[PDB]
Amino acid sequence: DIIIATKNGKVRGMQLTVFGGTVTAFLGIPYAQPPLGRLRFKKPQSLTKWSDIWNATKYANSCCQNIDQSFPGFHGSEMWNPNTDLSEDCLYLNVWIPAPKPKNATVLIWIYGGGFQTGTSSLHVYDGKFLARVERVIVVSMNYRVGALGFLALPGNPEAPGNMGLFDQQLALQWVQKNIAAFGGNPKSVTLFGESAGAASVSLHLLSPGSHSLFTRAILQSGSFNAPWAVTSLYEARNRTLNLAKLTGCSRENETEIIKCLRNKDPQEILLNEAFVVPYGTPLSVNFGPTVDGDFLTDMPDILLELGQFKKTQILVGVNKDEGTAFLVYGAPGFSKDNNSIITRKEFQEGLKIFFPGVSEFGKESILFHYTDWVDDQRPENYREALGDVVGDYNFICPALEFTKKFSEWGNNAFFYYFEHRSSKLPWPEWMGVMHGYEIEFVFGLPLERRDQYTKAEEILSRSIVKRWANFAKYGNPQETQNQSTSWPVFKSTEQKYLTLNTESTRIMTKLRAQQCRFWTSFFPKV
């Protein structure tokens, strides 16, 4: 029986058998007042404290969210859907600790992705028990509000100020500062890690003065705030809040009255109308996302980054070889997970309309010109591959690289990876390659489980990744020092060295997507 006394009460955890050893899991610890009734759309409020023992023995409710119903019965999409009941009562976190209890362990805090619209910490690919067992780190993950319930903004108004989901995260970081020593954790050694919107979130905690003293270091997998999907403008937010109001019968003259009306709606009515708050959307739409609220974010985050206004610490950042492919089957014509998706020039052009809904004709033409100078072959898969790269480069790779360049310019050590291994178990077709989201299982050590039918090369790759992430968290340096591994060099603005991650041979390379990112980064912000 494992009982830990926290600041707000006692919690009971449970023992898990992992790799002939033991891990203690505390699943579903509350970290804030349930944001119900009048607390809907507000910043999370602190917890009241309890006598008796909270049983943290199962994963808690996931936050309200729409679900991916595109491919019922299909593991590739369904694996990302929530696996616990949905509820507004969802502000809970999970703690995995090694056994025996550690003395002063480094802490890894996971922040999930899902476009700020979806996600939960209870997914099987975020199970922190392997990391705890193998590296003797403590792993923490939290549920934070998503969609309108987490990000609705009527800027400056404390009834709906925006960024609530980010304040949920921040309050979980505070819980860790205050409570993790009780669990054998070192609050002075805390590394945030996250993927996609989780990685964007981690990058915003780097920018937020309120988050400064709540963590040590940061890991950004496939995401950063400067991605074009990551921050909603005040103009967009206002329009989208007002659209939601109109759609739910909540239009009012008085804005505080709008919010009052919205707090009376069933959460299901809110979810149902989220997709419609924009005239046109893309498979990458973030209808309700982070905004400049003058609280969590004091200024436009691009300005903050450019001018060095961020936490000075080490970062580990990376992307996957085929970031863009996953999104192509959610609306690009000619694409299907169930065939090789050879598309024509015309289909490619229609695809750009899907992903760049406007975007001038000139803008779309410039994309076409840059990405379809076939050298050369023809080569039926030309257009198919081009559209994937457009989407991955614009949305994930070039922003991650620009983030890393601009961050490192202020003197800190940054390390960049390019993940190029496709899971032997991937249920998506071969043409999709090394997909967005599919490094996560390697980071969390799932291929370390021999019962699981990953290859031996995958076990080795995962073990190596796990060691490098742990060494980054503990020591600020993502090396694997014992098995004559390639040294991961620091990424600097001149030279821009990065490390490739794959089963055959780890390589030091330079200037990832140099030509492509010159297009997106230097030219396309104008168009």
Next chain:
Amino acid sequence: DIIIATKNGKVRGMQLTVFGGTVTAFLGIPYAQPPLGRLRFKKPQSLTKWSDIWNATKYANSCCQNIDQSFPGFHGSEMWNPNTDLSEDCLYLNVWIPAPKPKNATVLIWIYGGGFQTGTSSLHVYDGKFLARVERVIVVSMNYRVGALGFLALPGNPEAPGNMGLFDQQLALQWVQKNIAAFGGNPKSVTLFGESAGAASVSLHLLSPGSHSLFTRAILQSGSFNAPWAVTSLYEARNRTLNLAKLTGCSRENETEIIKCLRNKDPQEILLNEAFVVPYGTPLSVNFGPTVDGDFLTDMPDILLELGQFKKTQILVGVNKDEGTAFLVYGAPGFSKDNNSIITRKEFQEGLKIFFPGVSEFGKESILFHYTDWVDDQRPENYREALGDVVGDYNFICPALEFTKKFSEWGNNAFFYYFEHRSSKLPWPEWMGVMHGYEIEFVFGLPLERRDQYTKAEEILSRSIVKRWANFAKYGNPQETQNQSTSWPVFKSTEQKYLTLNTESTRIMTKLRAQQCRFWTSFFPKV
């Protein structure tokens, strides 16, 4: 009576009074066999030698060429038209020497512009008597063949090998090497200078192994071989030669027979058909220009420049503030030298069609996007100014800057100027500004003549320019060392310092047209 014994015979010159002093002029010395009959389209042949005295007492015939008839009676255009009879018998040069005869004077050799289609050394703005008088340099200038008669190419065929006009120039440089000591000149101190196509020519002598030992240093005013108008492709040349053949009734199966037929045509029939050898032309058309002949030019000159295959010496290069404006009244809709030429967006778009006849729609749109981001005003002269800058930047400024960057990268001192003074006497309207061609009169010292109604500030500016050019020719360093002048810094690829030339204040500036040239240089060669 002034008689000089040359390698090929005695020449008599004439005495000129200049600024209360004397200059000896030898106008119209032959330097090659007249390229008539069977010598038409061939490289120039050496001169036979003569007894008795050649009277070099007037300017010789100008080479056959079409004339600018756009504005009869108008000095601004007519000043560029030939002022001596046109003849195929035109291979003559001029020598001005100070009096008393110098002992070992530095030599400046002028190569005129005119798009390789027109020009003559006898123009009043190329009169070398002021330079000789004021700086005690020797000035030489030659007539070289222009148009088809100078540049017709059927590559590899000695009957019409291309580049004949460039070999004319080269043979005049040889004449100088062999003869200038007789006139008090130093063949080891020879500086080439030229403007527009003359400057492009100077840059090609830098690349030509045959010209290497024929000069010391080089000055490039408003031109360089990498300008888009400066070198004809082998494909274009062949098509244009064949088109000329078709147009003159000279189409044949045998190519040597084509040339034989062309040698029978009256030169007037050739001139008449030159404009038509291309389906569409621009006000900047160079129908018959330099080509890669494997003789004068051994490889594509861009490759030679990139890879450092050129004469290692100092260069002085520059451009005028409004290079592009002169061409706009030769076909852009809405433009007139006789009004302020306020054009609309649609007219601007039509203008691009005139100057970029194809050039995809995307290409033309990209130009529009880059040059019409009004910041901001509106501001009726927006489009008018934009089209001038497009034409000047693409055709003259960005190529001159890229030439200077690439040249200086191989270790030599380069000096770059930006000429921003508009002649008080300019007969063109004010909207045309600091025009192409209108620094030349300042270089040649015409404003030093007080009788001429230039301002006092212009006399001073000209005197300063003349000293800097002379110091560049004599010493490789374009300084004016005596009157507390701004030091002209070396232009280096990092930093890219240049000197502005104007009547108020000479400034050291950096990175001329940085944004515009990034567009033309990095992006537009693709489109």
